[PDB]
Amino acid sequence: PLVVATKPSSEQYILGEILSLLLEKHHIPIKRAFGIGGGTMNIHPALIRGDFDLYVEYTGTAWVNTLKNPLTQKVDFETIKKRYEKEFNLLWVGLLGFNNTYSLAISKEDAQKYAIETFSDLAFHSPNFDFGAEFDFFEREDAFKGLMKAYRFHFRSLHEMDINLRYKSFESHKINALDVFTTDAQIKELDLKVLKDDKGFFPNYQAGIVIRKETIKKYPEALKILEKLDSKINDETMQDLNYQVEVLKKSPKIVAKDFLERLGL
Ligand SMILES: C[N+](C)(C)[C@@H](Cc1c[nH]c(=S)[nH]1)C(=O)O
Numbered sequence: 725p726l727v728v729a730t731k732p733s734s735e736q737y738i739l740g741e742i743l744s745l746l747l748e749k750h751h752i753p754i755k756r757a758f759g760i761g762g763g764t765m766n767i768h769p770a771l772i773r774g775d776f777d778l779y780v781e782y783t784g785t786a787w788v789n790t791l792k793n794p795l796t797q798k799v800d801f802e803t804i805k806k807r808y809e810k811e812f813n814l815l816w817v818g819l820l821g822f823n824n825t826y827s828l829a830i831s832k833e834d835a836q837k838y839a840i841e842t843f844s845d846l847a848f849h850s851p852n853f854d855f856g857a858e859f860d861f862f863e864r865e866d867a868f869k870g871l872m873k874a875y876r877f878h879f880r881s882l883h884e885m886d887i888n889l890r891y892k893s894f895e896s897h898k899i900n901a902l903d904v905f906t907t908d909a910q911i912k913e914l915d916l917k918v919l920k921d922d923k924g925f926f927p928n929y930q931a932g933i934v935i936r937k938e939t940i941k942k943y944p945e946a947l948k949i950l951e952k953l954d955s956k957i958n959d960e961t962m963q964d965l966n967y968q969v970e971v972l973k974k975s976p977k978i979v980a981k982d983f984l985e986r987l988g989l
Contacts, residue, residue: 725753726939726946729776731763732887734969734976735824735907735962739780741980743933743950746989750949763860763887764789771936772812778935778950781816782824784927786934788866795870799927808934815940817933817947818954822907822962825929826867828919829894829904835917842922846901847875855879856899858887866927867903874925907963909970931957952989 728744730736737758744754757776760766768790770776787799791807801819808814828846830853835841838849846853855877861867862884871877883899891910893899904911904918911918933950940947957965961983968979 725755726777726943727755727757727775729757729760729767729770729779731767731779732759732761733905734909735905735966736780737976738965738969738979738983739820739931741976742953742983743778743780745977745980745984746949746953747946749984749989750945752943752946752949765860765863771814771934774936774938777939778933780820780931781934782929782931783819784825784866784929785864787927789864795866795925795927801930809937813937815935815937815947817935817950819930819932820953820957820962821930821955822957822959823928823930824905824907824959824962826926827904827906827921828901829911829916830901830919832915832917834900835919840917840919842920843871843875843925844922846919847877850877850879850901853879853901854881854883854899855901855903856883856885856890856893857903858890859884860887861903870925874923907959907966909963909967912967913971931962952987956987 726747728740730740740756740758744756747754764785767776767779771779783799783801783804786804787793788795791804805816808816828843830840840846840849857868883893885893890902894902904916965979965983968974969976
């Protein structure tokens with residue numbers, strides 16, 4: 725059977741269940757390998773070697789982490805696809821239609837207190853903030869290392885935690901500034917102030933299905949099926965599905981089932 729992997733986020737579970745249910749509807753055998761610790765850093769090699777068959781990746785993450793390209797070049801999907809096929813024998817099916825990129829968030833009270841609107845504002849007052857993020861945020865060149873080269877933050881403290889504990893650390897006041905994702909249900913849930921990336925540091929993170937070319941060779945129907953999801957999930961749809969899971973307490977499975985029904989797939 726085809727093994728569908730995801731990163732350990734609610735959004736990735738929704739996408740994984742959408743892929744798994746869609747393939748199961750076409751009688752393709754599926755095994756779920758959800759919430760792989762470390763995300764891409766462990767998904768990418770397992771995909772290359774064949775432990776996994778497909779997952780949903782973001783363009784800018786492949787651009788920096790796997791393709792070894794500099795952030796001085798604009799992320800280019802056609803380049804990503806060509807190099808993935810030539811060097812990795814991997815196929816980007818397409819783009820789902822939405823872009824979940826990095827941002828920075830603080831409490832709205834702190835934003836008003838310190839006149840913080842932009843990333844540079846946060847850096848300017850950073851000695852008054854305890855910043856927290858997931859482990860990989862301090863390792864990827866497109867995350868904290870680049871933010872430090874571009875903005876030179878001097879946070880009072882740094883806290884590394886499991887990716888699913890960040891907002892909880894913010895709620896407990898262990899940290900009072902953190903990295904967020906633009907489609908996170910918790911941005912609205914906690915009424916956070918998301919800062920403006922005034923130097924345009926973070927690239928494009930459009931979500932798309934990455935699948936082994938061997939799997940498409942064995943199952944052309946899987947490619948034909950998965951292309952029906954192309955451009956069917958814009959930013960608002962991803963944000964609402966995540967809201968349905970994290971706020972309305974629906975399971976990722978039920979959210980994916982309802983979405984596929986809505987699409988008529
Ligand atoms: C989707 N995203 C915002 C572009 C990040 C999120 C993420 C990074 N690492 C893990 S784990 N999750 C990514 O996958 O690079």
